[PDB]
């Protein structure tokens, strides 16, 4: 139709159409959980392959010593985003000698991602990120999304199927803030498994752990350091 | 070409229909009346006053807020008709214009002066396609030393006239119809005189007797070249006058 | 050049001398160095003559521009930041000793010092200029709290005089102006309206 | 060069020697200094020559725009508006020191304009090198609200100080007189000085040069 | 906001070899008020209706007929303010020639300058055509000229034409009553009857403004002198 | 008949369809309120839950823009918090360049103005959000500002945007606000807004509240705990008869 | 925006053309004849004069002929304006190389120049081509007289004789048949002319006032470009007429 | 310093109906002597010429811009540029350098196409114009050229005395110069024939 165009085409229903494909974008994308704890944040990614002989394309991402992302839509899109993000870090730790508060660096990120959602030519960023955080306020789970909103969460998941895992997180949601490490990371595999099909199970190739905290710099567990997490789950409960 | 003939994008950009208009010059003028108010503006012999209508619907609206009437400079002053957003930038604008006149040359820009710059910015509006004219019209009154009383009006089209007497609005063909059999039976227009012709033509056109909330009343005279807006005591103490006549 | 501005209770007095030398040469012997920047508003300029002019025509230019926007009388330390912001950005550039004193409803009479380089200040009264330097010890003398306008015009005028008579740079006419609610009163004192003090002999 | 302008009750008059040297010697002996700028405003000017010249023409420019687009006559106080932001803008580089007089609606006004860009508004100004001579002159005998004839004796007075006592000027003394009526351009108005008379004959005969070679080109 | 204008061409060639934003403009121009050009033996006339709509109006708030210099008119038909437009940069067009050259700019350089401006225009960028044509007299090396500038950009010299309304029928009667050897003040008696061929209704001194340009210059006519012509006719 | 595709091109009866179909945004959104009384300014705010996932204060829609003005927003939220800070940089560039505190209605002016630059042309989108700037100050009063998409500013004693605002209006018509303190509006603001949220449509909805006024001396600030719990319960007794 | 606006000016249609270079073409098509013929000793131009009215002012130095420098000249075909700003666009290269080399510049790097401007708007920019053909005649110590025809494509090629505007093919195949190459001297060369413009301009016959001819020669080592007067083309018609008399009553 | 590098001499003088335009022929740096035939004196129209004084770059410069300007100028219009125009069209050329000057000093010497009347006029590096009805110098020896022009003109000249008023000028001018000589060639413009000549001189 002739308003599904253009980013700055407003429908006569008072929507921006591109702005809704650029959040199918995002649901497109593998599905990724953030949850925290009083004193954790934990990024579970389920990664995908392309081929049997292929890696499981990378799902987090470092930002800065307190901050991590995990990734949903387009990469190429996730990587400009990342690479802003990273360079507001070091402005912060340059200018001031303090890391970024995560609030403001979600802030800065929704500015940037909000100016190409108004001007001719442009499109919308076609990515959604889940920020793990810790600074002074603690630990912080944010979401943000094509439309240049974010969201401070107890718990999100985000990609494909993730309402499987965002109805988990409802279930567990009283149960995250007193548990510790360990338990918050198998909620969070747990809440991931729940978008998987029957067939496939969490294994120790298709998933990524990013973990920040009051004492602990973020940290990715890729493939034989996930291992210690996946040890002691029970079998999907059907 | 044909009478009311298209081609292209004549209905949608500033450029030449089949024959010659510009159909977006057109909606804009249209766009004036899309606002519903109506406003008269009356020169006398030693003054100017304009007379605009006053709409407040709704008692949570400050209605100090709600006017139509600005000051450009000490001694110039507007009604501005149409669509209220276009109406403050062209102000603002007037506003820059006036003051960058004064800095530049020196002495206070004369009322024609400004309404020829206003009307050269918005003739380009009229001739580049990708921006929509203002939907708005403005109305100066100012004093001029040497010729006296100054009402000058500019339209969306770039098109700018000085004016004996003029309305814009809903309903200014009613009123200049009103206006044209006023001023064609001339006699000495005083001060008092001019307000009253003004408010008469308003509320004959808009069939409604008035009330000092529901109209909004500036003049600049010869004795007093300064724009300033009357009261509700000088509005009904007019009004009164009128009633009783 | 000295110019002098003093705060009494209901408004300011600013009062100059009238030369403007180039060299030992008196370019300009009635010169009028008190500008009214606004209705209420006055500045006294020392330094460059064209870099003073050049800035106190920009800031009427503002400040009436600002004074139409907001629809309300300005703030005589709007005027004395706007003249503040234009003498820092250019304070290489520029020569240009400011006294910046009027009325506010909101404040009452003001006087403001922006000296050259850029800083502002608020005193009671403030002084400028070349032959400045030869009336501190006076006008601190002789300043009290309190001073109705008649006072502070007659300190004004005897603090120019003592500056004019001592100082090459300064002469010519006395000019002032009181500045109150009601409006401006300027004035000139000339020829033996001019405080006299006696040279002292043998 | 001696330039001066007085304030007179029913206008203003302009004057200027019309000496130009080039460093100690004489370049033109008659130099005009009065420059129109419009119908009821003139200038004179003084220092660096091209500088004036151009500042002059240009200022006469715009305020031919001006004039044609208000439909008005020019005040003098848009000439010295325009020509003060013009030269502060250069920040002295264009060396135009300016006497600026007109008749306009509020009535005769008078500046000086120097080259950093400040202005002063005066009853008499004078300006150049002969400048002292001429103001000297000027302190000695202006009086407000003289008569044209009074105005005029003054003015080719105060240039004939500068003529005579200033090295940098000499020969005509040029007025201008504006009015609200009329505009009167009195070029020369005096002549104080003028070439000696020859008391002998130089040889100067047909013949006298030696040519190598010669070539004629007949024009159509 | 964003400043930036369209940077294609709104007037294009057409299948036919035509650019139709030009005829378009040309039809604002038929369709516009009246005016007449007659070069004389020494002057040129212009003379264009200006019937105000109303009695409201103040018929001398605007003017029709325009000075350039001391020395070249303008008059148009078509739209009113492109023409506000190129009488500007008419203006500065010439002042521009002037600060150059210090001699007034020859009549047929400033057309040239003015016509390469509206050539311009069919050309560049997110704009259309100006929609007026451009009457312009001026008296140069003793002698008179009488130009028209048209929306491409084309100017031609004439002796004689009429441009807007009934502008074939004008130029009809232009060439069965014009001759050469005329006055000025002939040429000015035949300007106003081939307007008064056009016009409806009564013609005054203000319904009509005339310029003359001669040796003593360009000048508007004021309506006393209008009266006096139209006494005479 | 493709008129409704730019804000550079009006429609043959004189309208912009891009600035109404933004408006209609704006009229999708929940519900803000913001009362003027005699002494202050008080904003409340329908914040609709639509997850259990997310915290508490995610997605505010009041925002202080200066020490003095306060922002209650409606409409696309990433608009809202660019318009926030436009104003946020038009009030920080007027205490640098004129050394004051910016007025309201000039703030409101300047970003009305702001808002309106994006209504002309065809390379930008209008916003779609309104928004209402409340202040307070001894100099020049308690004052509320309304900004529509289409950047018409205008001054208010109550007002309400967003999908209920008719209603909300209304019940704002019943309140003597002009003699009225901030103390007792905050009870008033909460018991209108809890009369407007719709239980069926909507599920869960925060009460966002802040204020301004010689209460909080001049500042805008969220209101504290202890009068929100009140004019909470005092609305949820108001709905029960 | 932008986009559902754009004419699309400078791309390529399915079939490998550029319309609005073919539309240009037309408009060309359309134009009042213009013809170029070389000759021994010298060159000429002969346009027909499309400004044909007896209100029109007597024109200064030629409608259609405008001189580049000391040594070329040129005639246009197309939209007069457009032609106009080419023209001047010339006159700068010529001075530009004048300045550079302190030499007259070669006539077929002028048109070169020219040529590579027209191309220019033909490929970026996004704007309308110019709608002009022009031919050009010159003199130049490398090749001596010659003839050259540029088109709104940007393409250009040398003649001996050639035509452009309206008829310009039936002007084309009558220089086929006529021209005798390496014999032609000025003389003939009008003679040519007169002929190919009679049978072109078949509505309107052969009046001086209907065409302008300018003729470009060399004399002392100088180039002379000269329009001719309205009585030389009176007397040139009056000789064409007498040859067609002479040549039907021989037959 | 930097006008004198190259050294050089022009000079043009009024006649009854003609005018006279002569330069020295030297180019040479410093004391340095490189050729003897140097132009200094451009035709700029039938009766129309202009002779450059100054560095010999900028001679060359200003000749070959001033050609390029004069050469639109006359093509834009289909007439002879008067002397003043070109006097005006100089100023503004030397003008729109004013901060990075040419260091030329051109004189213009000419008769108005259509009327004949002479025409002289100096200009300095920046253009300021001197128009006079007697004589204008320029170049290295200015002085000795205003002796000998002050001692020797006379009004209403016929060309023959013109000819030998400011060959004698120049000549004896240029023996009292260092860095001028070479040789002199003057140019005499009538209304119908122009008269170029080379003096003896001396060449040391």
Request: hydrophobic share 40%; charged share 25%.
């Given at each position: 139709?002739?308003?599904?165009?253009?980013?700055?085409?407003?429908?006569?229903?008072?929507?921006?159409?591109?702005?809704?494909?650029?959040?199918?974008?995002?649901?497109?994308?593998?599905?990724?959980?953030?949850?925290?704890?009083?004193?954790?944040?934990?990024?579970?990614?389920?990664?995908?392959?392309?081929?049997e002989?292929?890696?499981?394309?990378?799902?987090?991402?470092?930002?800065?010593?307190?901050?991590?992302?995990?990734?949903?839509?387009?990469?190429?899109?996730?990587?400009?985003?990342?690479?802003?993000?990273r360079?507001?870090?070091?402005?912060?730790?340059?200018?001031?000698?303090?890391?970024?508060?995560?609030?403001?660096?979600?802030?800065?990120?929704?500015?940037?991602?909000?100016?190409?959602?108004?001007?001719?030519?442009?499109?919308?960023?076609?990515?959604?990120?889940?920020?793990?955080?810790?600074?002074?306020?603690?630990?912080?789970?944010?979401?943000?999304?094509?439309?240049?909103?974010?969201?401070?969460?107890?718990?999100?998941?985000?990609?494909?199927?993730?309402?499987?895992?965002?109805?988990?997180?409802?279930?567990?949601?009283?149960?995250?803030?007193?548990?510790?490490?360990?338990?918050?990371?198998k909620?969070?595999?747990?809440?991931?498994?729940?978008?998987?099909?029957?067939?496939?199970?969490?294994?120790?190739?298709?998933?990524?752990?990013?973990?920040?905290?009051?004492?602990?710099?973020?940290?990715?567990?890729?493939?034989?350091?996930?291992?210690?997490?996946?040890?002691?789950?029970?079998?999907?409960?059907? | 070409?044909?009478?009311?003939?298209?081609?292209?994008?004549?209905?949608?950009?500033?450029?030449?229909?089949?024959?010659?208009?510009?159909?977006?010059?057109?909606?804009?003028?249209?766009?004036?009346?899309?606002?519903?108010?109506?406003?008269?503006?009356?020169?006398?012999?030693?003054?100017?006053?304009?007379?605009?209508?006053?709409?407040?619907?709704?008692?949570?609206?400050?209605?100090?807020?709600?006017?139509?009437?600005?000051?450009?400079?000490?001694?110039?002053?507007?009604?501005?008709?149409?669509?209220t957003?276009?109406?403050?930038?062209?102000?603002?604008?007037?506003?820059?214009?006036?003051?960058?006149?004064?800095?530049?040359?020196?002495?206070?820009?004369?009322?024609?002066?400004?309404?020829?710059?206003?009307?050269?910015?918005?003739?380009?509006?009229?001739?580049?396609?990708?921006?929509?004219?203002?939907?708005?019209?403005?109305?100066?009154?100012?004093?001029?030393?040497?010729?006296?009383?100054?009402?000058?009006?500019?339209d969306?089209?770039?098109?700018?006239?000085?004016?004996?007497?003029?309305?814009?609005?809903?309903?200014?063909?009613?009123?200049?119809?009103?206006?044209?059999?006023?001023?064609?039976?001339?006699?000495?227009?005083?001060?008092?005189?001019?307000?009253?012709?003004?408010?008469t033509?308003?509320?004959?056109?808009?069939?409604?007797?008035?009330?000092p909330?529901?109209?909004?009343?500036?003049?600049?005279?010869?004795?007093?070249?300064?724009?300033?807006?009357?009261?509700?005591?000088?509005?009904?103490?007019?009004?009164?006058?009128?009633?009783?006549? | 050049?000295?110019?002098?501005?003093?705060?009494?209770?209901?408004?300011?007095?600013?009062?100059?001398?009238?030369?403007?030398?180039?060299?030992?040469?008196?370019?300009?012997?009635?010169?009028?160095?008190?500008?009214?920047?606004?209705?209420?508003?006055?500045?006294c300029?020392?330094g460059?003559?064209?870099?003073?002019?050049?800035v106190?025509?920009?800031?009427t230019?503002?400040?009436?521009?600002?004074?139409?926007?907001?629809?309300?009388?300005?703030?005589?330390?709007?005027?004395?930041?706007?003249?503040?912001?234009?003498?820092?950005?250019?304070?290489?550039?520029?020569?240009?000793?400011?006294?910046?004193?009027?009325?506010?409803?909101?404040?009452?009479?003001?006087?403001?010092?922006?000296?050259?380089?850029?800083?502002?200040?608020?005193?009671?009264?403030?002084?400028?200029?070349?032959?400045?330097?030869?009336?501190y010890?006076?006008?601190?003398?002789?300043?009290?709290?309190?001073?109705?306008?008649?006072?502070?015009?007659?300190?004004?005028?005897?603090?120019?005089?003592?500056?004019?008579?001592?100082?090459?740079?300064?002469?010519?006419?006395?000019?002032?102006?009181?500045?109150?609610?009601?409006?401006?009163?300027?004035?000139?004192?000339?020829?033996?309206?001019?405080?006299?003090?006696?040279?002292?002999?043998? | 060069?001696?330039?001066?302008?007085?304030?007179?009750?029913?206008?203003?008059?302009?004057?200027?020697?019309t000496?130009?040297?080039?460093?100690?010697?004489?370049?033109?002996?008659?130099?005009?200094?009065?420059?129109?700028?419009?119908?009821?405003?003139?200038?004179?000017?003084?220092?660096?020559?091209?500088?004036?010249?151009?500042?002059?023409?240009?200022?006469?420019?715009?305020?031919?725009?001006?004039?044609?687009?208000?439909?008005?006559?020019?005040?003098?106080?848009?000439?010295?508006?325009?020509?003060?932001?013009?030269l502060?803008?250069?920040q002295?580089?264009?060396?135009?020191?300016?006497?600026?007089?007109?008749?306009?609606?509020?009535?005769?006004?008078?500046?000086?304009?120097?080259?950093?860009?400040?202005?002063?508004?005066?009853?008499?100004?004078?300006?150049?090198?002969?400048?002292?001579?001429?103001?000297?002159?000027?302190?000695?005998?202006?009086?407000?609200?003289?008569?044209?004839?009074?105005?005029?004796?003054?003015?080719?007075?105060?240039?004939?100080?500068?003529?005579?006592?200033?090295?940098?000027?000499?020969?005509?003394?040029?007025?201008?007189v504006?009015?609200?009526?009329?505009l009167?351009?009195?070029?020369?108005?005096?002549?104080?000085?003028?070439?000696?008379?020859?008391?002998?004959?130089?040889?100067?005969?047909?013949?006298?040069?030696?040519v190598?070679?010669?070539?004629?080109?007949?024009?159509? | 906001?964003?400043?930036?204008?369209?940077?294609?061409?709104?007037?294009?060639?057409?299948?036919?070899?035509?650019?139709?934003?030009?005829?378009?403009?040309?039809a604002?121009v038929?369709?516009?008020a009246?005016?007449?050009?007659?070069?004389?033996?020494?002057?040129?006339?212009?003379?264009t209706?200006?019937?105000?709509?109303?009695?409201?109006?103040?018929?001398?708030?605007?003017?029709?007929?325009?000075?350039?210099?001391?020395?070249?008119?303008?008059v148009?038909?078509?739209?009113?303010?492109?023409?506000?437009?190129?009488?500007?940069?008419?203006?500065?067009?010439?002042?521009?020639?002037?600060?150059?050259?210090?001699?007034?700019?020859?009549?047929?350089?400033?057309?040239?300058?003015?016509?390469?401006?509206?050539?311009?225009?069919?050309?560049?960028?997110?704009?259309?055509?100006?929609?007026?044509?451009?009457?312009?007299?001026?008296?140069?090396?003793?002698?008179?000229?009488?130009?028209?500038?048209?929306?491409?950009?084309?100017?031609?010299?004439?002796?004689?034409?009429?441009?807007?309304?009934?502008?074939?029928?004008?130029?009809?009667?232009?060439?069965?009553?014009?001759?050469?050897?005329?006055?000025?003040?002939?040429?000015?008696?035949?300007?106003?009857?081939?307007?008064?061929?056009?016009?409806?209704?009564?013609?005054?001194?203000?319904?009509?403004?005339?310029?003359?340009?001669?040796?003593?210059?360009?000048?508007?006519?004021?309506?006393?002198?209008?009266?006096?012509?139209?006494?005479?006719? | 008949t493709?008129?409704?595709?730019?804000?550079?091109?009006?429609?043959?009866?004189?309208?912009?369809?891009?600035?109404?179909?933004?408006?209609?945004?704006?009229?999708?959104?929940?519900?803000?309120?913001?009362?003027?009384?005699?002494?202050?300014?008080?904003?409340?705010?329908?914040?609709?839950?639509?997850?259990?996932?997310?915290?508490?204060?995610?997605?505010k829609?009041?925002?202080?823009?200066?020490?003095?003005?306060?922002?209650?927003?409606?409409?696309?939220?990433?608009?809202?918090?660019?318009?926030?800070?436009?104003?946020?940089?038009?009030?920080?560039?007027?205490?640098?360049?004129?050394?004051?505190?910016?007025?309201?209605?000039?703030?409101?002016?300047?970003?009305?103005?702001?808002?309106?630059?994006?209504?002309?042309?065809?390379?930008?989108?209008?916003?779609?959000?309104?928004?209402?700037?409340?202040?307070?100050?001894?100099?020049?009063?308690?004052?509320?500002?309304?900004?529509?998409?289409?950047?018409?500013?205008?001054?208010?004693?109550?007002?309400?945007?967003?999908?209920?605002?008719?209603?909300?209006?209304?019940?704002?018509?019943?309140?003597?606000?002009?003699?009225?303190?901030?103390?007792?509006?905050?009870?008033?603001?909460?018991?209108?807004?809890?009369?407007?949220?719709?239980?069926?449509?909507?599920?869960?909805f925060?009460?966002?509240?802040?204020?301004?006024?010689?209460?909080?001396?001049?500042?805008?600030?969220?209101?504290?705990?202890?009068?929100?719990?009140?004019?909470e319960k005092?609305?949820?007794?108001?709905?029960?008869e | 925006?932008?986009?559902?606006?754009?004419?699309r000016?400078?791309?390529?249609?399915?079939?490998?053309?550029?319309?609005?270079?073919?539309?240009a073409?037309?408009?060309?098509?359309?134009?009042?004849?213009?013809?170029?013929?070389?000759?021994n000793?010298?060159?000429?131009?002969?346009?027909?004069?499309?400004?044909?009215?007896?209100?029109?002012?007597?024109?200064?130095?030629?409608?259609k002929?405008?001189?580049?420098?000391?040594?070329?000249?040129?005639?246009?075909?197309?939209?007069?304006?457009?032609?106009?700003?080419?023209?001047?666009?010339?006159?700068?290269?010529?001075?530009?190389?004048?300045?550079q080399?302190?030499?007259?510049?070669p006539?077929?790097?002028?048109?070169?120049?020219?040529?590579?401007?027209?191309?220019?708007?033909?490929?970026?920019?996004?704007?309308?081509?110019?709608?002009?053909?022009?031919?050009?005649?010159?003199?130049?110590?490398?090749?001596?007289?010659?003839?050259?025809?540029?088109?709104?494509?940007?393409?250009?090629?040398?003649?001996?004789?050639?035509?452009?505007?309206?008829?310009?093919?039936?002007?084309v195949?009558?220089?086929?048949?006529?021209?005798?190459?390496?014999?032609?001297?000025?003389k003939?060369?009008?003679?040519?002319?007169?002929?190919?413009?009679?049978?072109?301009?078949?509505?309107?016959?052969?009046?001086?006032?209907?065409?302008?001819?300018?003729?470009?020669?060399?004399?002392?080592?100088?180039?002379?470009?000269?329009?001719?007067?309205?009585?030389?083309?009176?007397?040139?018609?009056?000789?064409?007429?007498?040859?067609?008399?002479?040549?039907?009553?021989?037959? | 310093?930097?006008?004198?590098?190259?050294?050089?001499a022009?000079?043009?003088?009024?006649?009854?109906?003609?005018?006279?335009?002569?330069?020295?022929?030297?180019?040479?740096?410093?004391?340095?002597?490189?050729?003897?035939?140097?132009?200094?004196?451009?035709?700029?129209?039938?009766?129309?010429?202009?002779?450059?004084?100054?560095?010999?770059?900028?001679?060359?410069?200003?000749?070959?811009?001033?050609?390029?300007?004069?050469?639109?100028?006359?093509?834009?219009?289909?007439?002879?540029?008067?002397?003043?125009?070109?006097?005006?069209?100089?100023?503004?050329?030397?003008?729109?350098?004013?901060?990075?000057?040419?260091?030329?000093?051109?004189?213009?010497?000419?008769?108005?196409?259509?009327?004949?009347?002479?025409?002289?006029?100096?200009?300095?590096?920046?253009?300021?114009?001197?128009?006079?009805?007697?004589?204008?110098?320029?170049?290295?020896?200015?002085?000795?050229?205003?002796?000998?022009?002050?001692?020797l003109?006379?009004?209403?000249?016929?060309?023959?005395?013109?000819?030998?008023?400011?060959?004698?000028?120049?000549?004896?001018?240029?023996?009292?110069?260092?860095?001028?000589?070479?040789?002199?060639?003057?140019?005499?413009?009538?209304?119908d024939?122009?008269?170029?000549?080379?003096?003896?001189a001396?060449?040391?």
């Amino acid at each position: 139709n002739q308003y599904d165009n253009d980013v700055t085409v407003w429908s006569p229903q008072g929507r921006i159409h591109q702005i809704e494909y650029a959040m199918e974008a995002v649901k497109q994308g593998s599905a990724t959980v953030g949850l925290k704890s009083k004193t954790h944040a934990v990024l579970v990614a389920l990664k995908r392959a392309q081929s049997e002989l292929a890696a499981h394309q990378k799902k987090i991402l470092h930002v800065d010593n307190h901050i991590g992302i995990s990734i949903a839509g387009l990469t190429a899109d996730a990587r400009l985003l990342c690479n802003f993000m990273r360079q507001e870090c070091l402005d912060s730790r340059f200018v001031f000698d303090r890391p970024l508060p995560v609030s403001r660096l979600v802030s800065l990120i929704g500015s940037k991602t909000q100016i190409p959602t108004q001007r001719y030519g442009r499109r919308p960023y076609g990515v959604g990120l889940l920020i793990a955080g810790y600074d002074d306020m603690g630990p912080h789970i944010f979401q943000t999304c094509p439309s240049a909103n974010y969201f401070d969460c107890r718990a999100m998941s985000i990609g494909a199927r993730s309402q499987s895992a965002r109805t988990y997180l409802e279930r567990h949601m009283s149960e995250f803030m007193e548990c510790n490490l360990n338990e918050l990371v198998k909620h969070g595999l747990r809440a991931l498994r729940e978008t998987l099909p029957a067939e496939q199970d969490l294994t120790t190739k298709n998933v990524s752990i990013g973990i920040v905290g009051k004492d602990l710099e973020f940290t990715i567990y890729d493939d034989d350091d996930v291992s210690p997490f996946l040890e002691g789950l029970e079998e999907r409960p059907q | 070409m044909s009478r009311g003939s298209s081609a292209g994008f004549d209905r949608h950009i500033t450029i030449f229909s089949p024959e010659g208009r510009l159909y977006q010059v057109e909606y804009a003028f249209k766009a004036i009346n899309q606002g519903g108010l109506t406003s008269v503006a009356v020169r006398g012999k030693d003054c100017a006053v304009i007379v605009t209508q006053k709409k407040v619907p709704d008692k949570l609206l400050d209605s100090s807020t709600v006017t139509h009437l600005f000051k450009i400079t000490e001694n110039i002053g507007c009604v501005m008709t149409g669509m209220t957003a276009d109406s403050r930038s062209q102000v603002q604008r007037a506003r820059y214009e006036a003051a960058n006149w004064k800095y530049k040359y020196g002495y206070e820009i004369p009322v024609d002066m400004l309404c020829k710059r206003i009307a050269d910015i918005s003739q380009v509006y009229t001739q580049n396609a990708e921006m929509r004219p203002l939907g708005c019209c403005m109305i100066l009154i100012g004093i001029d030393e040497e010729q006296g009383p100054q009402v000058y009006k500019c339209d969306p089209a770039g098109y700018y006239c000085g004016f004996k007497a003029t309305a814009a609005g809903v309903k200014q063909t009613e009123s200049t119809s009103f206006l044209e059999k006023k001023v064609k039976k001339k006699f000495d227009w005083t001060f008092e005189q001019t307000v009253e012709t003004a408010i008469t033509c308003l509320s004959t056109v808009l069939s409604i007797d008035f009330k000092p909330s529901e109209i909004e009343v500036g003049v600049v005279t010869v004795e007093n070249p300064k724009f300033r807006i009357l009261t509700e005591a000088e509005i009904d103490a007019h009004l009164v006058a009128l009633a009783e006549r | 050049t000295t110019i002098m501005a003093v705060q009494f209770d209901g408004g300011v007095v600013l009062g100059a001398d009238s030369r403007t030398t180039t060299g030992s040469y008196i370019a300009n012997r009635v010169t009028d160095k008190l500008t009214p920047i606004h209705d209420r508003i006055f500045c006294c300029r020392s330094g460059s003559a064209a870099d003073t002019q050049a800035v106190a025509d920009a800031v009427t230019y503002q400040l009436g521009f600002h004074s139409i926007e907001l629809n309300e009388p300005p703030l005589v330390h709007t005027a004395a930041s706007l003249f503040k912001e234009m003498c820092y950005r250019y304070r290489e550039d520029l020569m240009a000793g400011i006294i910046i004193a009027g009325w506010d409803p909101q404040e009452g009479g003001q006087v403001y010092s922006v000296p050259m380089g850029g800083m502002m200040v608020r005193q009671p009264f403030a002084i400028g200029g070349s032959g400045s330097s030869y009336i501190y010890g006076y006008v601190d003398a002789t300043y009290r709290e309190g001073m109705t306008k008649e006072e502070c015009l007659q300190f004004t005028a005897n603090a120019l005089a003592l500056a004019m008579e001592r100082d090459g740079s300064s002469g010519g006419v006395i000019r002032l102006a009181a500045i109150a609610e009601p409006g401006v009163e300027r004035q000139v004192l000339l020829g033996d309206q001019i405080p006299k003090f006696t040279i002292a002999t043998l | 060069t001696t330039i001066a302008g007085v304030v007179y009750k029913d206008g203003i008059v302009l004057g200027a020697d019309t000496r130009a040297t080039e460093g100690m010697v004489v370049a033109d002996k008659n130099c005009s200094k009065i420059h129109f700028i419009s119908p009821n405003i003139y200038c004179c000017g003084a220092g660096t020559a091209a500088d004036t010249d151009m500042t002059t023409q240009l200022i006469s420019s715009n305020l031919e725009l001006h004039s044609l687009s208000t439909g008005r006559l020019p005040r003098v106080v848009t000439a010295n508006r325009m020509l003060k932001q013009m030269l502060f803008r250069y920040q002295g580089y264009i060396g135009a020191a300016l006497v600026l007089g007109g008749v306009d609606v509020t009535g005769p006004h008078l500046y000086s304009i120097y080259p950093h860009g400040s202005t002063d508004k005066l009853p008499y100004v004078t300006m150049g090198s002969g400048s002292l001579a001429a103001m000297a002159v000027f302190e000695d005998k202006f009086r407000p609200d003289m008569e044209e004839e009074e105005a005029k004796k003054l003015v080719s007075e105060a240039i004939a100080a500068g003529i005579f006592n200033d090295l940098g000027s000499g020969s005509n003394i040029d007025l201008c007189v504006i009015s609200k009526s009329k505009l009167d351009f009195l070029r020369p108005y005096s002549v104080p000085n003028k070439k000696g008379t020859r008391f002998g004959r130089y040889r100067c005969e047909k013949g006298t040069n030696a040519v190598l070679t010669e070539k004629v080109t007949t024009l159509e | 906001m964003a400043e930036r204008g369209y940077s294609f061409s709104l007037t294009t060639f057409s299948p036919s070899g035509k650019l139709v934003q030009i005829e378009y403009a040309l039809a604002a121009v038929a369709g516009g008020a009246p005016s007449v050009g007659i070069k004389a033996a020494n002057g040129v006339v212009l003379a264009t209706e200006k019937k105000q709509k109303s009695i409201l109006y103040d018929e001398r708030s605007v003017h029709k007929v325009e000075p350039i210099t001391k020395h070249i008119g303008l008059v148009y038909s078509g739209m009113g303010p492109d023409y506000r437009v190129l009488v500007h940069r008419a203006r500065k067009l010439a002042q521009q020639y002037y600060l150059v050259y210090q001699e007034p700019i020859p009549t047929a350089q400033l057309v040239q300058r003015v016509a390469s401006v509206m050539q311009e225009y069919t050309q560049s960028g997110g704009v259309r055509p100006f929609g007026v044509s451009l009457l312009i007299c001026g008296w140069n090396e003793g002698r008179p000229y009488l130009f028209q500038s048209d929306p491409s950009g084309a100017y031609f010299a004439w002796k004689a034409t009429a441009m807007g309304k009934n502008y074939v029928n004008g130029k009809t009667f232009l060439e069965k009553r014009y001759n050469e050897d005329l006055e000025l003040e002939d040429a000015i008696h035949t300007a106003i009857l081939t307007l008064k061929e056009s016009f409806e209704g009564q013609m005054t001194e203000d319904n009509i403004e005339v310029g003359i340009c001669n040796e003593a210059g360009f000048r508007r006519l004021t309506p006393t002198e209008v009266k006096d012509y139209l006494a005479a006719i | 008949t493709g008129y409704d595709l730019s804000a550079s091109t009006f429609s043959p009866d004189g309208r912009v369809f891009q600035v109404e179909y933004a408006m209609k945004a704006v009229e999708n959104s929940s519900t803000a309120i913001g009362i003027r009384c005699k002494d202050g300014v008080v904003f409340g705010v329908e914040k609709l839950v639509l997850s259990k996932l997310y915290e508490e204060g995610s997605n505010k829609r009041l925002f202080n823009v200066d020490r003095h003005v306060g922002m209650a927003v409606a409409g696309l939220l990433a608009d809202a918090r660019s318009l926030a800070d436009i104003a946020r940089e038009e009030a920080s560039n007027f205490r640098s360049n004129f050394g004051y505190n910016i007025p309201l209605k000039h703030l409101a002016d300047r970003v009305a103005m702001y808002v309106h630059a994006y209504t002309l042309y065809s390379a930008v989108r209008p916003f779609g959000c309104s928004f209402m700037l409340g202040s307070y100050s001894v100099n020049d009063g308690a004052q509320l500002y309304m900004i529509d998409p289409s950047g018409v500013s205008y001054g208010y004693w109550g007002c309400a945007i967003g999908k209920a605002r008719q209603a909300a209006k209304t019940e704002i018509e019943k309140l003597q606000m002009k003699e009225m303190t901030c103390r007792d509006v905050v009870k008033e603001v909460a018991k209108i807004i809890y009369i407007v949220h719709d239980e069926v449509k909507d599920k869960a909805f925060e009460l966002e509240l802040s204020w301004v006024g010689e209460i909080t001396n001049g500042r805008h600030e969220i209101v504290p705990k202890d009068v929100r719990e009140e004019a909470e319960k005092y609305a949820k007794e108001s709905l029960k008869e | 925006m932008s986009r559902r606006y754009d004419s699309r000016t400078t791309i390529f249609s399915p079939e490998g053309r550029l319309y609005q270079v073919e539309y240009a073409m037309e408009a060309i098509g359309h134009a009042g004849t213009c013809l170029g013929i070389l000759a021994n000793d010298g060159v000429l131009l002969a346009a027909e004069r499309r400004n044909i009215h007896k209100l029109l002012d007597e024109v200064f130095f030629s409608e259609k002929i405008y001189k580049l420098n000391e040594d070329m000249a040129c005639s246009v075909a197309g939209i007069t304006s457009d032609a106009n700003v080419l023209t001047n666009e010339l006159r700068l290269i010529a001075q530009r190389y004048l300045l550079q080399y302190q030499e007259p510049i070669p006539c077929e790097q002028l048109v070169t120049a020219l040529c590579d401007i027209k191309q220019a708007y033909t490929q970026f920019g996004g704007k309308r081509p110019f709608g002009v053909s022009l031919l050009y005649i010159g003199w130049d110590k490398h090749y001596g007289f010659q003839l050259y025809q540029s088109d709104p494509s940007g393409n250009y090629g040398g003649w001996k004789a050639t035509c452009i505007g309206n008829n310009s093919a039936a002007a084309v195949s009558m220089l086929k048949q006529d021209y005798k190459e390496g014999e032609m001297t000025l003389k003939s060369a009008l003679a040519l002319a007169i002929k190919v413009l009679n049978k072109t301009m078949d509505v309107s016959k052969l009046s001086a006032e209907k065409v302008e001819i300018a003729t470009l020669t060399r004399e002392n080592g100088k180039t002379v470009i000269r329009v001719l007067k309205q009585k030389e083309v009176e007397q040139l018609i009056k000789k064409h007429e007498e040859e067609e008399a002479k040549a039907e009553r021989e037959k | 310093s930097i006008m004198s590098y190259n050294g050089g001499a022009v000079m043009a003088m009024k006649g009854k109906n003609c005018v006279a335009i002569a330069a020295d022929r030297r180019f040479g740096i410093q004391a340095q002597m490189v050729t003897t035939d140097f132009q200094k004196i451009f035709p700029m129209g039938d009766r129309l010429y202009i002779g450059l004084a100054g560095l010999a770059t900028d001679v060359q410069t200003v000749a070959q811009r001033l050609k390029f300007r004069l050469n639109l100028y006359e093509l834009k219009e289909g007439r002879q540029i008067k002397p003043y125009t070109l006097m005006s069209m100089v100023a503004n050329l030397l003008y729109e350098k004013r901060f990075g000057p040419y260091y030329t000093e051109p004189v213009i010497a000419g008769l108005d196409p259509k009327t004949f009347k002479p025409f002289i006029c100096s200009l300095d590096l920046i253009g300021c114009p001197m128009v006079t009805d007697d004589f204008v110098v320029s170049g290295t020896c200015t002085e000795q050229m205003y002796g000998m022009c002050e001692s020797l003109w006379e009004p209403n000249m016929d060309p023959e005395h013109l000819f030998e008023t400011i060959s004698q000028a120049m000549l004896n001018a240029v023996d009292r110069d260092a860095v001028s000589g070479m040789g002199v060639i003057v140019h005499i413009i009538e209304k119908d024939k122009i008269t170029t000549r080379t003096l003896k001189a001396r060449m040391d």
